[PDB]
Write a structure and sequence with these properties.
The structure is cut from a larger assembly and holds chains A (88 residues) and B (275 residues).
Chain A: H1 4-14, H2 24-44, H3 49-72, H4 74-84
Helix pairs in contact in A: 1-2, 2-3, 3-4
Chain B: E1 3-4, E2 16-17, E3 33-35, E4 60-62, E5 76-82, E6 91-96, E7 101-105, E8 115-116, E9 129-131, E10 140-142, E11 144-145, E12 152-154, E13 162-168, E14 171-175, E15 181-185, E16 189-192, H1 208-213, E17 269-271
Classes of the chains: A mainly alpha (88), B mainly beta (275).
The structure holds magnesium ion (276 copies).
Residues 56-57, 85, 213-215 of chain B line the site of one magnesium ion (MG).
Chain B binds seven RNA strands through strand 12, helix 1 and strand 17.
Chain lengths: 88, 275
RNA sequence: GAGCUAGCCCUGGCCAGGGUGAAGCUGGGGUGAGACCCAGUGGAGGCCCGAACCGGUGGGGGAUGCAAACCCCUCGGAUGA
RNA sequence: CCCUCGCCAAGGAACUCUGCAAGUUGGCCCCGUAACUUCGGGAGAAGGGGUGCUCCCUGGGGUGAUGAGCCCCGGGGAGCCGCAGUGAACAGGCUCUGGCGACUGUUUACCAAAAACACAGCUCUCUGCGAACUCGUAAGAGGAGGUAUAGGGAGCGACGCU
RNA sequence: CCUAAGGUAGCGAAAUUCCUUGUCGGGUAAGUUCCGACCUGCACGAAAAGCGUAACGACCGGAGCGCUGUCUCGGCGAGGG
RNA sequence: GCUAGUUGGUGGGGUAAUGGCCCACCAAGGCGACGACGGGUAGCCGGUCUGAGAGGAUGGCCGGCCACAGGGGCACUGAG
RNA sequence: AGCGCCGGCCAACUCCGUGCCAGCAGCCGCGGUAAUACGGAGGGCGCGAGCGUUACCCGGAUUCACUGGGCGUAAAGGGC
RNA sequence: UGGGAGAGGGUGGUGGAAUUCCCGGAGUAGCGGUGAAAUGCGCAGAUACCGGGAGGAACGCCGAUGGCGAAGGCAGCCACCUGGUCCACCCGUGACGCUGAGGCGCGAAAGCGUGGGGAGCAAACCGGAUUAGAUACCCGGGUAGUCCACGCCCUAAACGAUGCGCGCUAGGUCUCUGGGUCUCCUGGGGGCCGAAGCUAACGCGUUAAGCGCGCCGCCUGGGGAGUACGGCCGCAAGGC
RNA sequence: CCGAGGGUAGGGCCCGUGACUGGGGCGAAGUCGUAACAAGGUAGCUGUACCGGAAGGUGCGGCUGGAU
């Protein structure tokens, strides 16, 4: 799967402050991570519809956060989706 | 994956073409080609002996290595996969570390860059050739010789394969593409894997013109002829067969078995084809 | 006897000009990614119109002919079997 | 009188087996275009408007040099003449609706071009390779320097529903 | 009663229907043709395929518009005879 | 899904006067699931009938406003 | 001075005629030889220059439920 | 952050039992089948028995009133890839939420297209019975299909005939699976009986059909009829 | 110039009508069988598919709103 180390690296890279876990950017980034990994999975396993539901849920989850983040601070939003290359 | 066309002519509506995706090189090795002398279906007396042939695209013959036991132990790199107008399979250019270059028919799954080798000690991997006796029972195979050193005769068409079913003394039992069960001598070489271009059979010619490109001239029905010409010839208006359906030469053509009874190979054929 | 004619084989040659505008490619849109849509590009096809060329549809003429199959008008194919 | 040709009052298919023949239409630009459809088409559907010449203003391109000149493709005004401006010549009549054949093709050289043959495609069947099958007394050839996703024979004839 | 078994789907006066110009409906002033129907199918029918089908056709039907010396019905003129 | 006087602009014309009301050019806009566009029905209101009320139904007679004058277009005269 | 009604809803009953016929009927239903339900009569009830009928509107209809309804099995949870 | 359970999904492999068929052996007069029969199979050697082989499909025991999933649905075993979910810590973010017309995706079986595969079973079909008849039920055969890949179809007693979310309102008992300190306690599921309450009744009852709020879907007498017409979708069947 | 309208051509919607054809509702005094309600004499119902004079049957899968 996705390892403990790799997750740590993402978290520390988007953490707003030294200990920061669960902030929006960290959440969006963790989701962005899972999303992209699943996307690749589904490209090969087109017939795994059940996991695709998982993908929709993650996408849904990230969407809400980004609306929130963009509601609060447009600046951190624009920089986050750019840092992740997300809009489209 | 066969390629379709939009119906922008009446014929393009149904025409499909091979996608040619496995093909990496579009020119043949000059030292491995020779002219294919077209016959028009005529023999050395000048007579038509196979009807309705001729007028197809000019072709060069690619020399194919149907022996392999020729260069035992010498590995070769798969240099390219090419089109061969003279057969349904694709062909693969081998560069032997020898410096010798030869063609084989391309197996399904063969990759340019990969290495293949022939011999009793060859790994059991796609593209390698071994005597049948050293190939594991159950593995599917192709380009099978029928008698030792006489060259690959069996399972050469696109998409075909034979399967090793068992061993019995000097012989091994194959299921041929036809479903026929047969003993083949163990020293006969075969190449592991199935013949590639498996989608060949899904091609829809689409128009009369395409048959002509292939050297197939229009086939005319016996029922369309006159009694001088054919058993089915004649009759006022359309006519049913009016006798057992027959060849132009008078022999029956629905069911009449034609393989020679007292043929020596009958001792080696275990079960006649299916379907 | 295949210097006519039918088929095939080998090797050459020919097909004015105009029209339609397939795939693909690029860009844009779209989506989680896609499908896909739009534009530009592109230049496919026993595609279209029409000479050469190959034909021979209807009519008229000719009928001890210009001619033992021709002439006029009209008409089919014209990158393809 | 015959041939080839030109025109014709009023009528306009009443001719005749049949509009046969002959008229009509006719190029380009623009507008516009139905059922149905396999979404390509049907389509040049149909139908209609424009079309010459003169002067004035102007937009891009090619060759130059970035300019003049030359050559090419446009646009906008205002006018003039005739019955008539693709002013001659070359240049679809159209629509609705059935039958048959899917289609482009092929044919009775010299009375039949068709609904006939062929055709992609469908199915049956034979053939394990020194294949079956074909030609040959044979040798030898074709099949095929192919190998059952292949080759022969037969019927049916795109496709849809069977 | 008979048969090996008794024609299914679909289509049907049909490139098939003798009686026949069947009957009814449409179109026409008037329609042995044409189109739509009906079905006692003389004598359709499922790869000698059955029923349909966009596009295509110098194929063969039926109707209308346009336009005409095809005609009412013929006249004059030209050139070659 | 609708839209070429269509939506906006500039300039004129026209009116008692604003306005694409009308014209010329410039721009590519305007409207729509809060129902555009299209179809059907209807003149609207004060009121009236009913109903516990809410609501439902209705708008003849009287009053107010609108629209029409056989069907349709048009301007003239005039404070209108 | 007339008109409707007198089985139940709904106020008003008997005799004869008829015998699933003729007929009545708003709903439920009446009529097959002792019919308060058909037809007449006597009598009765209700209105009265009117009485009944047909049509239509609101009511009863919390039967589109805002006031004021529902959806396991009655009609009603969207396959997720 | 640290853990847990599971037929959740996808892909590639792989195991054994049994059925059928084929080969070899051995053997003989029947076998099969039913309520009873007959068709059928069998001296051209069947059935029953032994060994060999081929092939497809489904996974016995475990297995449960069990588990998982949003639903459809998911069951030999291995591996890889991957979804949901629960718990404990109470570490981070700071209302980021609920629902959800349209839209999009998924969606048992049957059915469709192209290609494979085909042992068993089995629409249609053929035959035997049964019966007054028997286009059935039962029996002997038997093709699609059932299976695989890809693409369609989009239905259902697709059911809990019960939309989703949240808060609140006795308990008793069985069970699955976590965490405790392991008596028992506390989470999350799955049942049963029941407090109050609801209900036309039957029944429901902390897995509500009770008491409340939010949003969506839906009903408005039976037939005609999920029909016709229009539209949209589908290759068709036919769906909305 | 615009312009009532007229004319030519081609589309869209709605109404009436049509040989014939499909099923539906009602009638009932008929013919055939008896599919459902009981275990309704093959438990029922169901989506789909194929089939049969008819109700209906069978296959595949589903539900219990199934008696014992
Ligand atoms: Mg998640
Ligand atoms: Mg966003
Ligand atoms: Mg390929
Ligand atoms: Mg394509
Ligand atoms: Mg194609
Ligand atoms: Mg294409
Ligand atoms: Mg075509
Ligand atoms: Mg290609
Ligand atoms: Mg290739
Ligand atoms: Mg080359
Ligand atoms: Mg050379
Ligand atoms: Mg050389
Ligand atoms: Mg050669
Ligand atoms: Mg040769
Ligand atoms: Mg020679
Ligand atoms: Mg010779
Ligand atoms: Mg000779
Ligand atoms: Mg031949
Ligand atoms: Mg030949
Ligand atoms: Mg090749
Ligand atoms: Mg190929
Ligand atoms: Mg093919
Ligand atoms: Mg060729
Ligand atoms: Mg051929
Ligand atoms: Mg032929
Ligand atoms: Mg002939
Ligand atoms: Mg001869
Ligand atoms: Mg002879
Ligand atoms: Mg003969
Ligand atoms: Mg014959
Ligand atoms: Mg004959
Ligand atoms: Mg003949
Ligand atoms: Mg005949
Ligand atoms: Mg003939
Ligand atoms: Mg013939
Ligand atoms: Mg013929
Ligand atoms: Mg025959
Ligand atoms: Mg004959
Ligand atoms: Mg015969
Ligand atoms: Mg022979
Ligand atoms: Mg041999
Ligand atoms: Mg010659
Ligand atoms: Mg010659
Ligand atoms: Mg040459
Ligand atoms: Mg050449
Ligand atoms: Mg030349
Ligand atoms: Mg040419
Ligand atoms: Mg050209
Ligand atoms: Mg050219
Ligand atoms: Mg050209
Ligand atoms: Mg272009
Ligand atoms: Mg390209
Ligand atoms: Mg393009
Ligand atoms: Mg071109
Ligand atoms: Mg171009
Ligand atoms: Mg062409
Ligand atoms: Mg061309
Ligand atoms: Mg052309
Ligand atoms: Mg020639
Ligand atoms: Mg010539
Ligand atoms: Mg000629
Ligand atoms: Mg010719
Ligand atoms: Mg001629
Ligand atoms: Mg002519
Ligand atoms: Mg001629
Ligand atoms: Mg003439
Ligand atoms: Mg002539
Ligand atoms: Mg003549
Ligand atoms: Mg002559
Ligand atoms: Mg000539
Ligand atoms: Mg000529
Ligand atoms: Mg011409
Ligand atoms: Mg020509
Ligand atoms: Mg032409
Ligand atoms: Mg052509
Ligand atoms: Mg042409
Ligand atoms: Mg050309
Ligand atoms: Mg051509
Ligand atoms: Mg050529
Ligand atoms: Mg002349
Ligand atoms: Mg005249
Ligand atoms: Mg005139
Ligand atoms: Mg006329
Ligand atoms: Mg006229
Ligand atoms: Mg006439
Ligand atoms: Mg006449
Ligand atoms: Mg005619
Ligand atoms: Mg003509
Ligand atoms: Mg003309
Ligand atoms: Mg012309
Ligand atoms: Mg002409
Ligand atoms: Mg039309
Ligand atoms: Mg047409
Ligand atoms: Mg179209
Ligand atoms: Mg086309
Ligand atoms: Mg035109
Ligand atoms: Mg047309
Ligand atoms: Mg014109
Ligand atoms: Mg002009
Ligand atoms: Mg000029
Ligand atoms: Mg002039
Ligand atoms: Mg130059
Ligand atoms: Mg210049
Ligand atoms: Mg003019
Ligand atoms: Mg013109
Ligand atoms: Mg002129
Ligand atoms: Mg000329
Ligand atoms: Mg002229
Ligand atoms: Mg033309
Ligand atoms: Mg004409
Ligand atoms: Mg037409
Ligand atoms: Mg025609
Ligand atoms: Mg017809
Ligand atoms: Mg006819
Ligand atoms: Mg036809
Ligand atoms: Mg043809
Ligand atoms: Mg023909
Ligand atoms: Mg066809
Ligand atoms: Mg054809
Ligand atoms: Mg046909
Ligand atoms: Mg053709
Ligand atoms: Mg051609
Ligand atoms: Mg042709
Ligand atoms: Mg032809
Ligand atoms: Mg001749
Ligand atoms: Mg001839
Ligand atoms: Mg001759
Ligand atoms: Mg001759
Ligand atoms: Mg001749
Ligand atoms: Mg001729
Ligand atoms: Mg001819
Ligand atoms: Mg022709
Ligand atoms: Mg001719
Ligand atoms: Mg034919
Ligand atoms: Mg022919
Ligand atoms: Mg033919
Ligand atoms: Mg076919
Ligand atoms: Mg096929
Ligand atoms: Mg031979
Ligand atoms: Mg011979
Ligand atoms: Mg011989
Ligand atoms: Mg030889
Ligand atoms: Mg040879
Ligand atoms: Mg040879
Ligand atoms: Mg050879
Ligand atoms: Mg071959
Ligand atoms: Mg043919
Ligand atoms: Mg034929
Ligand atoms: Mg079709
Ligand atoms: Mg018959
Ligand atoms: Mg039958
Ligand atoms: Mg008939
Ligand atoms: Mg008739
Ligand atoms: Mg017919
Ligand atoms: Mg007949
Ligand atoms: Mg006769
Ligand atoms: Mg007749
Ligand atoms: Mg006759
Ligand atoms: Mg008649
Ligand atoms: Mg009439
Ligand atoms: Mg008539
Ligand atoms: Mg008539
Ligand atoms: Mg006629
Ligand atoms: Mg005729
Ligand atoms: Mg007819
Ligand atoms: Mg009759
Ligand atoms: Mg026939
Ligand atoms: Mg025949
Ligand atoms: Mg025929
Ligand atoms: Mg036949
Ligand atoms: Mg045919
Ligand atoms: Mg037909
Ligand atoms: Mg047709
Ligand atoms: Mg043609
Ligand atoms: Mg033709
Ligand atoms: Mg006319
Ligand atoms: Mg004349
Ligand atoms: Mg004269
Ligand atoms: Mg003259
Ligand atoms: Mg003269
Ligand atoms: Mg003269
Ligand atoms: Mg003269
Ligand atoms: Mg202004
Ligand atoms: Mg005024
Ligand atoms: Mg305006
Ligand atoms: Mg303007
Ligand atoms: Mg503009
Ligand atoms: Mg609304
Ligand atoms: Mg109105
Ligand atoms: Mg009104
Ligand atoms: Mg009330
Ligand atoms: Mg009103
Ligand atoms: Mg009133
Ligand atoms: Mg008033
Ligand atoms: Mg008015
Ligand atoms: Mg007026
Ligand atoms: Mg009046
Ligand atoms: Mg007036
Ligand atoms: Mg009263
Ligand atoms: Mg009573
Ligand atoms: Mg009362
Ligand atoms: Mg009372
Ligand atoms: Mg009486
Ligand atoms: Mg009364
Ligand atoms: Mg009595
Ligand atoms: Mg009495
Ligand atoms: Mg009463
Ligand atoms: Mg009374
Ligand atoms: Mg009074
Ligand atoms: Mg009321
Ligand atoms: Mg109310
Ligand atoms: Mg309420
Ligand atoms: Mg209620
Ligand atoms: Mg609710
Ligand atoms: Mg219900
Ligand atoms: Mg539900
Ligand atoms: Mg974790
Ligand atoms: Mg045995
Ligand atoms: Mg055994
Ligand atoms: Mg169990
Ligand atoms: Mg359970
Ligand atoms: Mg659960
Ligand atoms: Mg905290
Ligand atoms: Mg804080
Ligand atoms: Mg939705
Ligand atoms: Mg499904
Ligand atoms: Mg299935
Ligand atoms: Mg199926
Ligand atoms: Mg099928
Ligand atoms: Mg299938
Ligand atoms: Mg098919
Ligand atoms: Mg299949
Ligand atoms: Mg089988
Ligand atoms: Mg039976
Ligand atoms: Mg019986
Ligand atoms: Mg009977
Ligand atoms: Mg039976
Ligand atoms: Mg059975
Ligand atoms: Mg069986
Ligand atoms: Mg079938
Ligand atoms: Mg099938
Ligand atoms: Mg089928
Ligand atoms: Mg599938
Ligand atoms: Mg749905
Ligand atoms: Mg259940
Ligand atoms: Mg549930
Ligand atoms: Mg439901
Ligand atoms: Mg909901
Ligand atoms: Mg524990
Ligand atoms: Mg516990
Ligand atoms: Mg619990
Ligand atoms: Mg309980
Ligand atoms: Mg209680
Ligand atoms: Mg309640
Ligand atoms: Mg509590
Ligand atoms: Mg409890
Ligand atoms: Mg729960
Ligand atoms: Mg309840
Ligand atoms: Mg109803
Ligand atoms: Mg429907
Ligand atoms: Mg339905
Ligand atoms: Mg419809
Ligand atoms: Mg539904
Ligand atoms: Mg006007
Ligand atoms: Mg007008
Ligand atoms: Mg006028
Ligand atoms: Mg009727
Ligand atoms: Mg039953
Ligand atoms: Mg019963
Ligand atoms: Mg029963
Ligand atoms: Mg069923
Ligand atoms: Mg039937
Ligand atoms: Mg019967
Ligand atoms: Mg049955
Ligand atoms: Mg079942
Ligand atoms: Mg279920």
């Amino acid at each position: 799967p996705i390892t403990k180390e790799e997750k740590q690296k993402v978290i520390q890279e988007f953490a707003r402050f030294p200990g920061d876990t669960g902030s929006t950017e960290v959440q969006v980034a963790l989701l962005t991570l899972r999303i992209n990994r699943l996307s690749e999975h589904l490209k090969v396993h087109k017939k795994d519809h059940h996991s695709h539901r998982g993908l929709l849920m993650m996408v849904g989850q990230r969407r809400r956060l980004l609306r929130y983040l963009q509601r609060e601070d447009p600046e951190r939003y624009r920089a986050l989706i750019e840092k992740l290359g997300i809009r489209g | 994956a066969v390629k379709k066309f939009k119906p922008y002519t009446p014929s393009r509506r149904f025409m499909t073409v091979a996608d040619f995706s496995e093909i990496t090189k579009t020119e043949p090795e000059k030292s491995l080609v020779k002219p294919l002398k077209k016959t028009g279906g005529r023999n050395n007396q000048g007579r038509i002996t196979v009807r309705f042939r001729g007028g197809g695209h000019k072709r060069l013959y690619r020399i194919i290595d149907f022996k392999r036991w020729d260069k035992v132990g010498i590995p070769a790199k798969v240099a390219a996969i090419e089109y061969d107008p003279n057969r349904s399979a694709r062909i693969a250019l081998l560069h032997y570390v020898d410096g010798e270059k030869r063609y084989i028919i391309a197996p399904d799954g063969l990759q340019v860059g990969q290495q293949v080798v022939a011999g009793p000690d060859a790994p059991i991997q796609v593209g390698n050739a071994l005597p049948l006796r050293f190939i594991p029972v159950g593995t599917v195979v192709h380009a099978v010789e029928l008698e030792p050193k006489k060259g690959a005769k069996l399972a050469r068409a696109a998409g075909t394969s034979a399967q090793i079913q068992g061993r019995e003394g000097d012989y091994v039992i194959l299921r041929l593409p036809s479903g026929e069960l047969r003993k083949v001598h163990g020293e006969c070489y075969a190449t592991v894997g199935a013949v590639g271009n498996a989608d060949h059979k899904n091609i829809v010619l689409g128009k009369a013109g395409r048959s002509r490109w292939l050297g197939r001239r229009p086939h005319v029905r016996g029922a369309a002829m006159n009694p001088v010409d054919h058993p089915h010839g004649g009759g006022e208006g359309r006519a049913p067969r009016g006798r057992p359906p027959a060849s132009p030469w008078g022999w029956q053509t629905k069911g009449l078995k034609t393989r020679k009874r007292r043929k020596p190979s009958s001792r080696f054929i275990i079960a006649r084809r299916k379907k």
